[PDB]
Amino acid sequence: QVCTGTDMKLRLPASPETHLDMLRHLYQGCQVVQGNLELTYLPTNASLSFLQDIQEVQGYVLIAHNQVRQVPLQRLRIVRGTQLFEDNYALAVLDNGDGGLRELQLRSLTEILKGGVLIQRNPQLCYQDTILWKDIFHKNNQLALTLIDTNRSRACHPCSPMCKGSRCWGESSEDCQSLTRTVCAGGCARCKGPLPTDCCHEQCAAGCTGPKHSDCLACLHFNHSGICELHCPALVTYNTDTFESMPNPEGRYTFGASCVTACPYNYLSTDVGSCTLVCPLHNQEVTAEDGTQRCEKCPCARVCYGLGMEHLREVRAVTSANIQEFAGCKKIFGSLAFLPESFDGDPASNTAPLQPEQLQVFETLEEITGYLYISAWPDSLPDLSVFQNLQVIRGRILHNGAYSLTLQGLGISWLGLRSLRELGSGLALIHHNTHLCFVHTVPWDQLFRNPHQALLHTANRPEDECVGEGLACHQLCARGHCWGPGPTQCVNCSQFLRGQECVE
C-alpha cells in the first residue's frame, strides 16, 4: 500500500513518545512514500519496527534532533524531488542527537531527481561521508547542492570492506550503497550497475533487473501493470486506418511511479493517463465508483487550497492571513493546522490573536485532501465538535508528513470526531492530554481504510482513570464501542430502521 512520509523542518515535535506509535503504524505495510519524508525528535530507544517497509520517496528526506540510535528506513529507493527541503534539498540531516543516530542504513536509496543534500554537525552519525551523492543525484539533476558535515563526538568504525567504492550508509555490509549514475555506461539515463548490460530501460529509475521495461523495480516513467512506458498506454488511442480515436483496452494511469487501470484511493486520474496527488494546472477533480479520483482537463471550478499548496507552500500552519484561502469550500485542496503560532499570529506584524469562535468554520469540512493538525486549541472545547463531520482525510499532504489528525497538549476530554472513519492516508496522534478518554473505546478494528493505522497513546489520560470515572459506551451502540460519551458517539445504531428513523 501507499502513505505519506514525514515533514518536520522547524515544526513542533508532535510527541517523541507518540511519534514511535505513529511511525510504526504509518509505515507498516507501506511500500510508497507520498510526498516528502522527515524523521525528527524521536526517543533514543523508540521501537520503530516498520520504517524499513517503504520503497519509494517522492519529496525530501530529513533526519534531525532525533535521539534514536537507529531509524531503519532501509528500503527507500528513489527521491522524486516533488518538493524540496526549504526549497533546496533532497536530503538533510541536523543535530540528530545531543543518544543520537549512529548509522542510517538507507541501502536502497539511489536516486535524487531534484535537490541537494544538507547535513550539519551530527554528534553520533557517521558514514554520511561514505555516500556517493554525486551518483545519487540523477543524471539530469544539477540542483544538487551538497554539504557533508563530518563533525562528530565519537570514533567511527570504518565502512565495510565489502562495499563497492567503500560506499555505505553504516559500518555493515548490509549498509552498502548502490551506484546508479556514474556507472551508466553507454549514456543511459539510469542503471543498476556498470556496462550497458546493467543499464536500465530508460523508463526505469535507478533500479531494474535490466534494460527491458518489464523488468524495472522503480520508474521515472510508469509501471503499467508492472511495465514502464513514458506515459501509460493512452487512455484513448487511435486507429491509424482512419486515424480516428478509440478507447484503449490497455489504457492506464501513472499512479505515482506505477500505472494502473484504476487508481487506489486518494489518487487522481487525469485524462492524459496520469495518477497524481496534486492536479496539474487546469485539471478538475472527479471521483469514480471504483475509488479512482480524477484530475481531468477543464471552464474550471474555484478551488480552496490549503497548506502545502501554491502560494501556501511556504506555510505549514494556518495563520490569520490564511482565513480567506481556507474558507468557503466543503473541502480543502491541501492541509490545515493549529499551532501555538496560529494562535499567536505574528506580533511583529501587529496581528490579532486567534478567536476560538472562528474554528466553527470547519463545520462542513467533509474532506481534507491534506491534514488536520492541532497542537494548540481552545480549552473551552472538550472535543472536536467542529470536525465531527470530517468524514474524510486523504492525506495527500500530512502534518509533519504523518498526521491526518494531531491532538497534542490540548484541553479536549474526548475525541468526539464521529464521522472520521475514512482515512485515506495518515495517522492520528494523541499526546500530552491527560484529560482524554475513548482512545481504546472506539472500535478501531472496523474504522480503517487501509493498513496505515493502529492503537496509539502517550501521556493521555490512562484508561484506568476513565474507568475510575465509570466511563462506558451507551447501549444503543453495537459492541459498546464509541468516540465520546452518549449514543451518538458510537460507530452505529443497532436497532430499528423505520422509514426515516433509527429507533429502539
JSON list of N, CA, C and O in Angstrom, two decimals, residues 302-341:
[
{"chain": "A", "resi": 302, "resn": "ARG", "atom": "N", "xyz": [-13.66, 26.90, -8.97]},
{"chain": "A", "resi": 302, "resn": "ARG", "atom": "CA", "xyz": [-12.90, 27.55, -7.91]},
{"chain": "A", "resi": 302, "resn": "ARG", "atom": "C", "xyz": [-12.47, 26.51, -6.90]},
{"chain": "A", "resi": 302, "resn": "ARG", "atom": "O", "xyz": [-13.29, 25.72, -6.44]},
{"chain": "A", "resi": 303, "resn": "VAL", "atom": "N", "xyz": [-11.19, 26.51, -6.56]},
{"chain": "A", "resi": 303, "resn": "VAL", "atom": "CA", "xyz": [-10.65, 25.58, -5.58]},
{"chain": "A", "resi": 303, "resn": "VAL", "atom": "C", "xyz": [-9.97, 26.31, -4.42]},
{"chain": "A", "resi": 303, "resn": "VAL", "atom": "O", "xyz": [-9.19, 27.24, -4.65]},
{"chain": "A", "resi": 304, "resn": "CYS", "atom": "N", "xyz": [-10.28, 25.89, -3.18]},
{"chain": "A", "resi": 304, "resn": "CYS", "atom": "CA", "xyz": [-9.68, 26.40, -1.95]},
{"chain": "A", "resi": 304, "resn": "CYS", "atom": "C", "xyz": [-8.46, 25.56, -1.67]},
{"chain": "A", "resi": 304, "resn": "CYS", "atom": "O", "xyz": [-8.54, 24.32, -1.65]},
{"chain": "A", "resi": 305, "resn": "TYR", "atom": "N", "xyz": [-7.36, 26.21, -1.44]},
{"chain": "A", "resi": 305, "resn": "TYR", "atom": "CA", "xyz": [-6.10, 25.49, -1.29]},
{"chain": "A", "resi": 305, "resn": "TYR", "atom": "C", "xyz": [-5.62, 25.62, 0.13]},
{"chain": "A", "resi": 305, "resn": "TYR", "atom": "O", "xyz": [-5.73, 26.72, 0.68]},
{"chain": "A", "resi": 306, "resn": "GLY", "atom": "N", "xyz": [-5.10, 24.51, 0.65]},
{"chain": "A", "resi": 306, "resn": "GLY", "atom": "CA", "xyz": [-4.60, 24.51, 2.00]},
{"chain": "A", "resi": 306, "resn": "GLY", "atom": "C", "xyz": [-3.10, 24.64, 2.05]},
{"chain": "A", "resi": 306, "resn": "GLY", "atom": "O", "xyz": [-2.43, 24.95, 1.06]},
{"chain": "A", "resi": 307, "resn": "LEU", "atom": "N", "xyz": [-2.58, 24.32, 3.20]},
{"chain": "A", "resi": 307, "resn": "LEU", "atom": "CA", "xyz": [-1.17, 24.44, 3.49]},
{"chain": "A", "resi": 307, "resn": "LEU", "atom": "C", "xyz": [-0.48, 23.44, 2.60]},
{"chain": "A", "resi": 307, "resn": "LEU", "atom": "O", "xyz": [-1.02, 22.36, 2.32]},
{"chain": "A", "resi": 308, "resn": "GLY", "atom": "N", "xyz": [0.70, 23.82, 2.10]},
{"chain": "A", "resi": 308, "resn": "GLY", "atom": "CA", "xyz": [1.46, 22.92, 1.26]},
{"chain": "A", "resi": 308, "resn": "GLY", "atom": "C", "xyz": [1.18, 23.14, -0.23]},
{"chain": "A", "resi": 308, "resn": "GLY", "atom": "O", "xyz": [1.87, 22.57, -1.07]},
{"chain": "A", "resi": 309, "resn": "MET", "atom": "N", "xyz": [0.20, 23.99, -0.56]},
{"chain": "A", "resi": 309, "resn": "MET", "atom": "CA", "xyz": [-0.12, 24.24, -1.96]},
{"chain": "A", "resi": 309, "resn": "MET", "atom": "C", "xyz": [-0.01, 25.67, -2.46]},
{"chain": "A", "resi": 309, "resn": "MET", "atom": "O", "xyz": [-0.49, 26.61, -1.85]},
{"chain": "A", "resi": 310, "resn": "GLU", "atom": "N", "xyz": [0.51, 25.78, -3.66]},
{"chain": "A", "resi": 310, "resn": "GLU", "atom": "CA", "xyz": [0.62, 27.03, -4.39]},
{"chain": "A", "resi": 310, "resn": "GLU", "atom": "C", "xyz": [1.31, 28.10, -3.56]},
{"chain": "A", "resi": 310, "resn": "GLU", "atom": "O", "xyz": [2.45, 27.92, -3.11]},
{"chain": "A", "resi": 311, "resn": "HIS", "atom": "N", "xyz": [0.62, 29.19, -3.27]},
{"chain": "A", "resi": 311, "resn": "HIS", "atom": "CA", "xyz": [1.19, 30.28, -2.51]},
{"chain": "A", "resi": 311, "resn": "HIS", "atom": "C", "xyz": [1.27, 29.93, -1.04]},
{"chain": "A", "resi": 311, "resn": "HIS", "atom": "O", "xyz": [1.88, 30.65, -0.24]},
{"chain": "A", "resi": 312, "resn": "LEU", "atom": "N", "xyz": [0.67, 28.82, -0.68]},
{"chain": "A", "resi": 312, "resn": "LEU", "atom": "CA", "xyz": [0.65, 28.34, 0.66]},
{"chain": "A", "resi": 312, "resn": "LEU", "atom": "C", "xyz": [1.74, 27.28, 0.86]},
{"chain": "A", "resi": 312, "resn": "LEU", "atom": "O", "xyz": [1.86, 26.73, 1.95]},
{"chain": "A", "resi": 313, "resn": "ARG", "atom": "N", "xyz": [2.59, 27.03, -0.14]},
{"chain": "A", "resi": 313, "resn": "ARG", "atom": "CA", "xyz": [3.66, 26.04, 0.03]},
{"chain": "A", "resi": 313, "resn": "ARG", "atom": "C", "xyz": [4.64, 26.47, 1.10]},
{"chain": "A", "resi": 313, "resn": "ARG", "atom": "O", "xyz": [5.38, 25.67, 1.67]},
{"chain": "A", "resi": 314, "resn": "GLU", "atom": "N", "xyz": [4.67, 27.77, 1.37]},
{"chain": "A", "resi": 314, "resn": "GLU", "atom": "CA", "xyz": [5.54, 28.40, 2.33]},
{"chain": "A", "resi": 314, "resn": "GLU", "atom": "C", "xyz": [5.09, 28.19, 3.78]},
{"chain": "A", "resi": 314, "resn": "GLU", "atom": "O", "xyz": [5.87, 28.41, 4.71]},
{"chain": "A", "resi": 315, "resn": "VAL", "atom": "N", "xyz": [3.83, 27.82, 3.98]},
{"chain": "A", "resi": 315, "resn": "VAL", "atom": "CA", "xyz": [3.31, 27.71, 5.32]},
{"chain": "A", "resi": 315, "resn": "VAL", "atom": "C", "xyz": [2.89, 26.30, 5.68]},
{"chain": "A", "resi": 315, "resn": "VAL", "atom": "O", "xyz": [2.19, 25.63, 4.93]},
{"chain": "A", "resi": 316, "resn": "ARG", "atom": "N", "xyz": [3.31, 25.85, 6.86]},
{"chain": "A", "resi": 316, "resn": "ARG", "atom": "CA", "xyz": [2.95, 24.52, 7.35]},
{"chain": "A", "resi": 316, "resn": "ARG", "atom": "C", "xyz": [1.94, 24.59, 8.48]},
{"chain": "A", "resi": 316, "resn": "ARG", "atom": "O", "xyz": [1.56, 23.55, 9.05]},
{"chain": "A", "resi": 317, "resn": "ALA", "atom": "N", "xyz": [1.47, 25.80, 8.77]},
{"chain": "A", "resi": 317, "resn": "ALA", "atom": "CA", "xyz": [0.49, 26.08, 9.81]},
{"chain": "A", "resi": 317, "resn": "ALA", "atom": "C", "xyz": [-0.37, 27.25, 9.37]},
{"chain": "A", "resi": 317, "resn": "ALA", "atom": "O", "xyz": [0.09, 28.12, 8.63]},
{"chain": "A", "resi": 318, "resn": "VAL", "atom": "N", "xyz": [-1.61, 27.28, 9.83]},
{"chain": "A", "resi": 318, "resn": "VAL", "atom": "CA", "xyz": [-2.52, 28.33, 9.45]},
{"chain": "A", "resi": 318, "resn": "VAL", "atom": "C", "xyz": [-2.44, 29.54, 10.31]},
{"chain": "A", "resi": 318, "resn": "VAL", "atom": "O", "xyz": [-2.44, 29.47, 11.53]},
{"chain": "A", "resi": 319, "resn": "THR", "atom": "N", "xyz": [-2.38, 30.67, 9.66]},
{"chain": "A", "resi": 319, "resn": "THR", "atom": "CA", "xyz": [-2.39, 31.93, 10.35]},
{"chain": "A", "resi": 319, "resn": "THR", "atom": "C", "xyz": [-3.60, 32.74, 9.94]},
{"chain": "A", "resi": 319, "resn": "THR", "atom": "O", "xyz": [-4.45, 32.28, 9.17]},
{"chain": "A", "resi": 320, "resn": "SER", "atom": "N", "xyz": [-3.73, 33.93, 10.48]},
{"chain": "A", "resi": 320, "resn": "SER", "atom": "CA", "xyz": [-4.93, 34.73, 10.20]},
{"chain": "A", "resi": 320, "resn": "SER", "atom": "C", "xyz": [-5.01, 35.14, 8.74]},
{"chain": "A", "resi": 320, "resn": "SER", "atom": "O", "xyz": [-6.09, 35.23, 8.15]},
{"chain": "A", "resi": 321, "resn": "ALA", "atom": "N", "xyz": [-3.87, 35.24, 8.11]},
{"chain": "A", "resi": 321, "resn": "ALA", "atom": "CA", "xyz": [-3.75, 35.62, 6.72]},
{"chain": "A", "resi": 321, "resn": "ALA", "atom": "C", "xyz": [-4.24, 34.53, 5.80]},
{"chain": "A", "resi": 321, "resn": "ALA", "atom": "O", "xyz": [-4.35, 34.73, 4.59]},
{"chain": "A", "resi": 322, "resn": "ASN", "atom": "N", "xyz": [-4.46, 33.34, 6.33]},
{"chain": "A", "resi": 322, "resn": "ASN", "atom": "CA", "xyz": [-4.87, 32.22, 5.53]},
{"chain": "A", "resi": 322, "resn": "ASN", "atom": "C", "xyz": [-6.39, 31.99, 5.61]},
{"chain": "A", "resi": 322, "resn": "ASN", "atom": "O", "xyz": [-6.93, 31.12, 4.92]},
{"chain": "A", "resi": 323, "resn": "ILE", "atom": "N", "xyz": [-7.10, 32.83, 6.33]},
{"chain": "A", "resi": 323, "resn": "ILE", "atom": "CA", "xyz": [-8.53, 32.58, 6.51]},
{"chain": "A", "resi": 323, "resn": "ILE", "atom": "C", "xyz": [-9.32, 32.53, 5.23]},
{"chain": "A", "resi": 323, "resn": "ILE", "atom": "O", "xyz": [-10.19, 31.68, 5.07]},
{"chain": "A", "resi": 324, "resn": "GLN", "atom": "N", "xyz": [-9.05, 33.43, 4.31]},
{"chain": "A", "resi": 324, "resn": "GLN", "atom": "CA", "xyz": [-9.80, 33.51, 3.08]},
{"chain": "A", "resi": 324, "resn": "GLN", "atom": "C", "xyz": [-9.40, 32.47, 2.05]},
{"chain": "A", "resi": 324, "resn": "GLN", "atom": "O", "xyz": [-10.07, 32.31, 1.03]},
{"chain": "A", "resi": 325, "resn": "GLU", "atom": "N", "xyz": [-8.28, 31.77, 2.28]},
{"chain": "A", "resi": 325, "resn": "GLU", "atom": "CA", "xyz": [-7.83, 30.78, 1.32]},
{"chain": "A", "resi": 325, "resn": "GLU", "atom": "C", "xyz": [-8.38, 29.41, 1.70]},
{"chain": "A", "resi": 325, "resn": "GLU", "atom": "O", "xyz": [-8.60, 28.55, 0.85]},
{"chain": "A", "resi": 326, "resn": "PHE", "atom": "N", "xyz": [-8.63, 29.24, 3.00]},
{"chain": "A", "resi": 326, "resn": "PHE", "atom": "CA", "xyz": [-9.08, 28.00, 3.61]},
{"chain": "A", "resi": 326, "resn": "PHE", "atom": "C", "xyz": [-10.55, 27.96, 3.94]},
{"chain": "A", "resi": 326, "resn": "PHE", "atom": "O", "xyz": [-11.01, 27.08, 4.67]},
{"chain": "A", "resi": 327, "resn": "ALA", "atom": "N", "xyz": [-11.31, 28.94, 3.47]},
{"chain": "A", "resi": 327, "resn": "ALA", "atom": "CA", "xyz": [-12.71, 29.02, 3.83]},
{"chain": "A", "resi": 327, "resn": "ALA", "atom": "C", "xyz": [-13.62, 29.15, 2.64]},
{"chain": "A", "resi": 327, "resn": "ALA", "atom": "O", "xyz": [-13.27, 29.73, 1.61]},
{"chain": "A", "resi": 328, "resn": "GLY", "atom": "N", "xyz": [-14.85, 28.66, 2.81]},
{"chain": "A", "resi": 328, "resn": "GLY", "atom": "CA", "xyz": [-15.90, 28.75, 1.78]},
{"chain": "A", "resi": 328, "resn": "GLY", "atom": "C", "xyz": [-16.14, 27.48, 0.92]},
{"chain": "A", "resi": 328, "resn": "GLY", "atom": "O", "xyz": [-17.17, 27.39, 0.24]},
{"chain": "A", "resi": 329, "resn": "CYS", "atom": "N", "xyz": [-15.23, 26.49, 0.99]},
{"chain": "A", "resi": 329, "resn": "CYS", "atom": "CA", "xyz": [-15.27, 25.21, 0.28]},
{"chain": "A", "resi": 329, "resn": "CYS", "atom": "C", "xyz": [-15.55, 24.10, 1.29]},
{"chain": "A", "resi": 329, "resn": "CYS", "atom": "O", "xyz": [-15.10, 24.15, 2.44]},
{"chain": "A", "resi": 330, "resn": "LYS", "atom": "N", "xyz": [-16.24, 23.05, 0.84]},
{"chain": "A", "resi": 330, "resn": "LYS", "atom": "CA", "xyz": [-16.53, 21.87, 1.68]},
{"chain": "A", "resi": 330, "resn": "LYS", "atom": "C", "xyz": [-15.30, 21.00, 1.87]},
{"chain": "A", "resi": 330, "resn": "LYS", "atom": "O", "xyz": [-15.28, 20.07, 2.69]},
{"chain": "A", "resi": 331, "resn": "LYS", "atom": "N", "xyz": [-14.32, 21.24, 1.03]},
{"chain": "A", "resi": 331, "resn": "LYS", "atom": "CA", "xyz": [-13.11, 20.51, 1.12]},
{"chain": "A", "resi": 331, "resn": "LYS", "atom": "C", "xyz": [-11.98, 21.44, 0.83]},
{"chain": "A", "resi": 331, "resn": "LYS", "atom": "O", "xyz": [-12.12, 22.36, 0.03]},
{"chain": "A", "resi": 332, "resn": "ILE", "atom": "N", "xyz": [-10.85, 21.15, 1.42]},
{"chain": "A", "resi": 332, "resn": "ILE", "atom": "CA", "xyz": [-9.67, 21.94, 1.14]},
{"chain": "A", "resi": 332, "resn": "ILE", "atom": "C", "xyz": [-8.66, 21.15, 0.36]},
{"chain": "A", "resi": 332, "resn": "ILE", "atom": "O", "xyz": [-8.23, 20.06, 0.78]},
{"chain": "A", "resi": 333, "resn": "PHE", "atom": "N", "xyz": [-8.21, 21.71, -0.76]},
{"chain": "A", "resi": 333, "resn": "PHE", "atom": "CA", "xyz": [-7.23, 21.02, -1.56]},
{"chain": "A", "resi": 333, "resn": "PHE", "atom": "C", "xyz": [-5.88, 21.37, -0.96]},
{"chain": "A", "resi": 333, "resn": "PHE", "atom": "O", "xyz": [-5.16, 22.25, -1.40]},
{"chain": "A", "resi": 334, "resn": "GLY", "atom": "N", "xyz": [-5.60, 20.70, 0.12]},
{"chain": "A", "resi": 334, "resn": "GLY", "atom": "CA", "xyz": [-4.43, 20.93, 0.92]},
{"chain": "A", "resi": 334, "resn": "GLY", "atom": "C", "xyz": [-4.78, 20.75, 2.38]},
{"chain": "A", "resi": 334, "resn": "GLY", "atom": "O", "xyz": [-5.87, 20.32, 2.73]},
{"chain": "A", "resi": 335, "resn": "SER", "atom": "N", "xyz": [-3.85, 21.11, 3.22]},
{"chain": "A", "resi": 335, "resn": "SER", "atom": "CA", "xyz": [-3.96, 20.93, 4.66]},
{"chain": "A", "resi": 335, "resn": "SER", "atom": "C", "xyz": [-4.31, 22.11, 5.54]},
{"chain": "A", "resi": 335, "resn": "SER", "atom": "O", "xyz": [-4.22, 23.24, 5.10]},
{"chain": "A", "resi": 336, "resn": "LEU", "atom": "N", "xyz": [-4.66, 21.87, 6.81]},
{"chain": "A", "resi": 336, "resn": "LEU", "atom": "CA", "xyz": [-4.86, 22.93, 7.81]},
{"chain": "A", "resi": 336, "resn": "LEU", "atom": "C", "xyz": [-4.29, 22.54, 9.20]},
{"chain": "A", "resi": 336, "resn": "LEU", "atom": "O", "xyz": [-4.35, 21.38, 9.60]},
{"chain": "A", "resi": 337, "resn": "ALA", "atom": "N", "xyz": [-3.73, 23.51, 9.93]},
{"chain": "A", "resi": 337, "resn": "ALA", "atom": "CA", "xyz": [-3.22, 23.24, 11.26]},
{"chain": "A", "resi": 337, "resn": "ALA", "atom": "C", "xyz": [-3.23, 24.42, 12.19]},
{"chain": "A", "resi": 337, "resn": "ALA", "atom": "O", "xyz": [-3.03, 25.57, 11.80]},
{"chain": "A", "resi": 338, "resn": "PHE", "atom": "N", "xyz": [-3.36, 24.08, 13.46]},
{"chain": "A", "resi": 338, "resn": "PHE", "atom": "CA", "xyz": [-3.47, 24.95, 14.60]},
{"chain": "A", "resi": 338, "resn": "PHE", "atom": "C", "xyz": [-2.29, 24.78, 15.55]},
{"chain": "A", "resi": 338, "resn": "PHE", "atom": "O", "xyz": [-2.28, 23.90, 16.42]},
{"chain": "A", "resi": 339, "resn": "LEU", "atom": "N", "xyz": [-1.30, 25.64, 15.36]},
{"chain": "A", "resi": 339, "resn": "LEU", "atom": "CA", "xyz": [-0.04, 25.63, 16.09]},
{"chain": "A", "resi": 339, "resn": "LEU", "atom": "C", "xyz": [-0.05, 26.80, 17.05]},
{"chain": "A", "resi": 339, "resn": "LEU", "atom": "O", "xyz": [-0.83, 27.72, 16.83]},
{"chain": "A", "resi": 340, "resn": "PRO", "atom": "N", "xyz": [0.73, 26.83, 18.13]},
{"chain": "A", "resi": 340, "resn": "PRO", "atom": "CA", "xyz": [0.80, 27.96, 19.02]},
{"chain": "A", "resi": 340, "resn": "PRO", "atom": "C", "xyz": [0.94, 29.24, 18.23]},
{"chain": "A", "resi": 340, "resn": "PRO", "atom": "O", "xyz": [0.20, 30.19, 18.44]},
{"chain": "A", "resi": 341, "resn": "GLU", "atom": "N", "xyz": [1.76, 29.19, 17.17]},
{"chain": "A", "resi": 341, "resn": "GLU", "atom": "CA", "xyz": [1.89, 30.35, 16.33]},
{"chain": "A", "resi": 341, "resn": "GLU", "atom": "C", "xyz": [0.60, 30.68, 15.58]},
{"chain": "A", "resi": 341, "resn": "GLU", "atom": "O", "xyz": [0.37, 31.83, 15.24]}
]
